[PDB]
Give the backbone structure.
Amino acid sequence: HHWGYGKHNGPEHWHKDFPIAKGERQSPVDIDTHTAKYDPSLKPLSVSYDQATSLRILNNGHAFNVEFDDSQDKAVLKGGPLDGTYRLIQFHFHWGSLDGQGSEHTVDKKKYAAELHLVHWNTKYGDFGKAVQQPDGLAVLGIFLKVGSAKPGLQKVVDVLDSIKTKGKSADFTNFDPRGLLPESLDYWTYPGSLTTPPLLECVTWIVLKEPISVSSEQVLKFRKLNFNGEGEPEELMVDNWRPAQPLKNRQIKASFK
Ligand SMILES: NS(=O)(=O)c1ccc(C(=O)NCc2c(F)c(F)c(F)c(F)c2F)cc1
Ligand SMILES: [Hg+2]
Ligand SMILES: [Zn+2]
């Protein structure tokens, strides 16, 4: 019926209901490292997640989102290529059916096992809904996940997946510290883009970290046990919930490092 990642309702069909899919600043894109422009005027990123308040985790039929209380400047992102304070509202992942695919952004055509998106909205706009009507309304921090050693800080997320196996299910998920998902370095690439899922709105200053975090095979395997379907419907494993790379067109990807 509506949108998804299957053969009959996947990314290639999105343009029919969301014409912006063929827009000028669509995401994700391939990051050509030799064409990215080192911009020495970019400030370092400033991630202030010490007061973060996670509230819930839910399976929305497309991915699982961990939501945060964004009623106050509790967990924010500023600095980098951003002007203003962006508030963390939630994070989710995109992953594949196999270790060699899953990320949305690619680096020199290399695909990672998954990609974490920490979604933030520009506070000057009042609420998330208004931010999605502005060219600089959102800032998504993207982090690549490669399969290797286990990420301790990701385990609490992994263990709770059993209780939100199907579409629509949710579970209280308090006291989760998102700082446990950050890599060691905050070096990044940035470019103007969009939401990678419908409505595909062209807001979003993408901030993709250079350094991937590593998770274990067992950790990513639990992601693959989730379902796209609701309880009582035919089981469809939630895998490959990623959108292929879009044409860069008239945009330049800047890097904070050389
Ligand atoms: N993969 S990603 O690029 O990081 C991405 C992040 C967030 C969303 C999303 O929040 N959809 C919900 C949503 C909207 F996109 C709205 F524009 C809106 F007004 C809403 F109320 C709403 F719930 C979609 C894709
Ligand atoms: Hg917009
Ligand atoms: Zn995403």
